[PDB]
User: Fold GCN4 leucine zipper from Saccharomyces cerevisiae.
Amino acid sequence: MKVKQLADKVEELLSKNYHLANEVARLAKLVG
Amino acid sequence: MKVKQLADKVEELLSKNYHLANEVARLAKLVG
Amino acid sequence: MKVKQLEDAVEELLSANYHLENAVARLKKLV
Amino acid sequence: MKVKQLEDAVEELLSANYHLENAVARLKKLVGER
Ligand code: NA
Assistant:
């Protein structure tokens, strides 16, 4: 269904967001 | 330190990012 | 250029938070 | 309205991820990581 597909898309995009935030955190610690 | 101030700012904004992402997740599950 | 690059990173994070705030706003309205 | 509201949230999440991608690329360049 449409609502389920969109709910799944939200979770897919949030998983990518958490990774990207984790990468910013990782790299921020290295900036010197 | 300019650099340290900006590194701390990155961390501050990432902390807010994580909360906002958790809220989208919480609310998506109620809408859906 | 270190400071300019961090300043730019900060601007990107401000924009990322702006858009997540908007998503939170749309979904509260939905629920 | 819930389909419209979820579509709009997806659009905001796409924009949010775009900006985080940009922050990652910027910091990679700063620290010299591929
Ligand atoms: Na934007």
